[PDB]
Structures are given as structure tokens and as C-alpha cells.
Amino acid sequence: SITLPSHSKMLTSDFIFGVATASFQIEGATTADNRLPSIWDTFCATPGKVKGMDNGEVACDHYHLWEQDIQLIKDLGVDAYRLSIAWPRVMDKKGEANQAGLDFYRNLLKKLKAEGLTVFATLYHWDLPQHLEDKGGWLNRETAYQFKNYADLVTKELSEWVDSWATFNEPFCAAILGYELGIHAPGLSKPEFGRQAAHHILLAHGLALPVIRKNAPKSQVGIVLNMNRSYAASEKAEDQFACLMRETLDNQFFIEPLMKGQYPQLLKTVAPQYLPTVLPGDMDIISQPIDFLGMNFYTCNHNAYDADDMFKNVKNSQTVEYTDIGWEIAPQAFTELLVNLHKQYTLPPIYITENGAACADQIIDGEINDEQRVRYLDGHINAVNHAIESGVDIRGYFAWSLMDNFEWAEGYSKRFGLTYVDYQTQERTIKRSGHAYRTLLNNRK
């Protein structure tokens, strides 16, 4: 089961529990209602980039099944639901509004609020329109101004039904996996590309902030970062260096510009090819105040010195448990990450906007006995409680994901849902972990 002490702050009305999804991972209907092609439509159609023959054309068919999926959200007992908006659906190539695309989100959001739910909406969850990538994508500074215009349109239409707006989900993935390592769409692989893409995404966040605050004055506005905990492979100084470099390029590179108006200064002497070209005034735009920080956490990593790359990712030298995607289960590292970031920065309030596990789930006798995921969620929910008791200001927790879905370059081969999906019939079946989550939430006195 999943349990907290009955005097935990997490079990009061000052704390919200939810579940999360993203547009391209669940919606399908990629050619309905003049939706434009996205960079992930192109990436799936490129041989070798996405597992097997998997693509996003059908996914969980949420574009058509949204009403029964709201009843599913109700059944799980959650306070809140986090989703993303698809930029390819809501405007055409000239920038004009696509009303059919907007109607999908109008009807979905109204129904969620009529059911009493709190709504978190992400504006950018990786589905960039391909026509913008044809002119350079996030390497073209103009893409940030295009994002401001998109944020302006969407928040004018949806302002009455959204409680919390996030500009971006996981700039590390969109910039570094997409343009530096070649793992995510569009798939370029140089640091000179990835680090300039990261600067233009943080610029786009800052350009949209004042527009979102003007258009939606009753909402909260922030950004969502992914952060995992980095360790040294041993006590040796060269492995301490490897760890420091991993954490500087993966985590500090994104939180330091937001909070302090600068990129990590040690890079000027260690590795200046990782610093972007910054125009006068850009850091003032990037570091404007935000109302909350979203944190996505899953795992830890271990780092050994490497002569060519500074660090090399290695396995824990001690015996530990791994999820089906190969990530170490380490809830103690979750508490450590939160407390250390709290000691480094003066932070806004935090929401855990994603936490979850991929498991080799099978439907047997009409049910899914996903005991690994039950233990994962129990451990990580108590790890958040330990961080709160240590003084970290955390106000909500969202499990990834509502349901099994398209997991990016792994395709459908990695299942993260609290709900199982049969893709051939589209039948949804709540797993043991979803039932344990619902029991935790419904027992709140």
C-alpha cells in the first residue's frame, strides 16, 4: 500500500495530489482538424530514431476518448490534473487561430472544472511545429518570439479554466537531448547547437511571462525542470570532478540563469564551448520572478572520470533495484536533491510535477499486479514528506502518468501509467498502484 503519517502536512487541504500527461504522448488524431505536423511526427518517420515502428498517429486516442478519461481522473480520487496544450493544433502556419483545435481544449477544460478539479497546463511539452524547425527551430532566435505569440493566443482563450500555467516542461530534454545528443526530436548532436537552443528556450519563457500574467491575472505562473541526483562513482578526487561536471551541465545550467541571471561561471575555464551567445538584456528577461518551480524527479546517476568527456555514466557499484527502463530506485536521493537545492538558492514554492516508474506490466486475470510501482510511489511520497519536515516548501505532488502512453524514443515499449491501456482495443484498466493511490487520497479525513 501507500501510506503517510496522519499528521503529515501532505494530508491537509494545503497540499494537492494529482496525475499528469502530455499532448503528443496520449492524444493521437495527428491529422484531425488541420493539425500541423510536429518535429516528433518527422522524428518517428525517420528510420532508427524511435523504437520499432512506433509513432504518435493513434497513441491512447485521447482526442476522441477525453470524456471517459475525465471519468477515469475522477475515479482515481485526485485533486488536480496536469496536461499540455499542442501548439500544432491551435494555429495555422501564418499564425492565425485554429478554432477546431481550440475547441478540443475549451470542452476538456470546462468539463474538468465542472467536476471540481484543479488544472495545471503546460504550454510547451516538445511538439514544436515542423515549419518552425524548417527555419532552424530552437536555433533560430525568432522561435522564442513565436512562442510568446502562441502563449498570448492560448491564455486569452483559456484564462477562465486554468489555475497554474507552466511555460516549458524539461528544457534539458528539448535542448540537450534534441540538439546536443541526438536522442530526441529534431535530432541534431553538437553542444554548440544544444546550448544555444537552451538559451533561446529560457528567453522564450521570459518573453511569455508578462503576457501570461496580463491575460490570466487569477493564475499562478512558473516553469518545470527535470532534476536527478548525481553521485561520484568513488571517493577519488577525479570522480568528485566528474560528478561536479555532470551536475553543472544537467541541473545548474538551467536553474542558475532563472534564479541569478547568469550561466555557470566555472564553464569559462573548464569548458567554454558549452556557453551560449547571449545578447545584451537577455539575462534580465530570463530571470524575471516566477510564482512556483515544478520539479520532475525519477532517479540518481553515478559518474566516473573520463579523459575525453569529463564524466562517464556508470552503474552503482552496490546492488540496487532497477525499473524496466533501467533507472535506479533511490527515494533517499529524492530527499537529498530537494534539501540541497533549498540550501543553494532562495527558491519559490515547489510542486513535484512528475514522479513515477516504468514496469513490465501484464494484464492477468483482468488485473495488473504492479507491486514494484506500489513500492516506488510509497517510498517517493514519504521522501517528499521527509523534505518538507526538513524545511523545503513543497505544495503538491503529481504522479507520472495517468495512463500508459507514447514514451518518446522508447515508443510504447515502456509503460508508466497508474492505468493500463490495451492499444488494440483502447480499453483502460486501473492497476494495483492506481487503486493504492486512490485509497491514500480517499482516506484523507
CA distances from 17 to 111, 164, 372, 382 (A): 19, 14, 20, 13
| Residue 407 falls in the annotated catalytic set | no
- Please pick, among 170, 247, 328, 407, the residue that the annotation labels catalytic: 170
Residues in CB range of 289: below 8 A, 6 or more apart = 348
Q: Which three-class secondary structure string do you get for the chain? A: CCCCCCCCHHHCCCCEEEEECCHHHHCCCCCHHHCCCEHHHHHHCCCCCCCCCCCCCCCCCHHHHHHHHHHHHHHCCCCEEEEECCHHHHECCCCCECHHHHHHHHHHHHHHHHCCCEEEEEEECCCCEHHHHCCCHHHCCHHHHHHHHHHHHHHHHHHHHCCEEEEEECHHHHHHHHHCCCCCCCCCCCHHHHHHHHHHHHHHHHHHHHHHHHHCCCCEEEEEEECCEEEECCCCHHHHHHHHHHHHHHHHHHHHHHHHCCCCCCHHHHCHHHCCCCCCCHHHHHCCCCCEEEEECCCEEEEEEECCCEEEEECCCCCCCECCCCCECCHHHHHHHHHHHHHHCCCCCEEEEECCCCECCCCECCECCCHHHHHHHHHHHHHHHHHHHCCCCEEEEEEECCCCCCCHHHHHHCECCCEEECCCCCCEEECHHHHHHHHHHHCCC
Cβ burial of 324 (10 Å; 0-12, 13-18, 19+) is middle
Residues in CB range of 283: below 8 A, 6 or more apart = 257, 261, 262
**Residue ranges of domains in the chain:** 9-226+290-299+326-442
Which neighbouring-strand residues pair with 398?
18
Distance CA 50, CA 53 (A): 7
Helix axes 331-344, 371-389, angle to 10 degrees: 30
Cell of 351: 510542486
Residues in CB range of 366: below 8 A, 6 or more apart = 429
Distance CA 70, CA 157 (A): 21
Phi, psi of 47 (to 5 degrees): -55, 135
Which neighbouring-strand residues pair with 230?
301
Distance CA 121, CA 401 (A): 15
Angle, CA of 231, 235 and 240, to the nearest 5°: 50
Chain-centroid distance of CA 179 in Å reads 18
Whether the bond into 186 is cis, omega within 30 of 0: yes
Specify the experimental method: X-ray
Residues in CB range of 268: below 8 A, 6 or more apart = 275
CB 126 within 8 A of CB 172: no
Chain-centroid distance of CA 142 in Å reads 24
Chain-centroid distance of CA 139 in Å reads 21
Phi, psi of 19 (to 5 degrees): -135, 160
Q: What is the CA radius of gyration of the chain?
A: 21
For residue 173, give the amino acid letter.
C
Sign of CA dihedral 374, 375, 376, 380: positive
Distance CA 172, CA 298 (A): 14
Cell of 400: 507520472
Cell of 276: 551560449
CB 408 within 8 A of CB 24: no
CA distances from 365 to 323, 362, 403, 425 (A): 23, 10, 19, 17
User: Both ends of the chain: CA-CA distance in Å?
Assistant: 18
Distance CA 417, CA 21 (A): 10
Q: CATH fold of 9-226+290-299+326-442, please?
A: TIM Barrel (3.20.20)
Distance CA 171, CA 165 (A): 16
CA distances from 88 to 31, 34, 38, 132, 140 (A): 10, 9, 7, 11, 18
Cell of 11: 494530508
Q: What pairing do the DSSP bridges indicate for beta strands 419-421 and 428-430?
A: antiparallel
Resolution rounded to one decimal, in angstroms: 1.8
Cell of 82: 496536469
Distance CA 296, CA 224 (A): 7
Cell of 338: 530537494
Helix axes 253-260, 191-215, angle to 10 degrees: 40
- How many C-beta neighbours within 10 Å does residue 293 have? 22
114-129 CB burial, b ≥16 within 10 A, e <16 = eeebbbbbbbbbbbbb
Cell of 329: 530506485
| Residue 336 falls in the annotated catalytic set | no
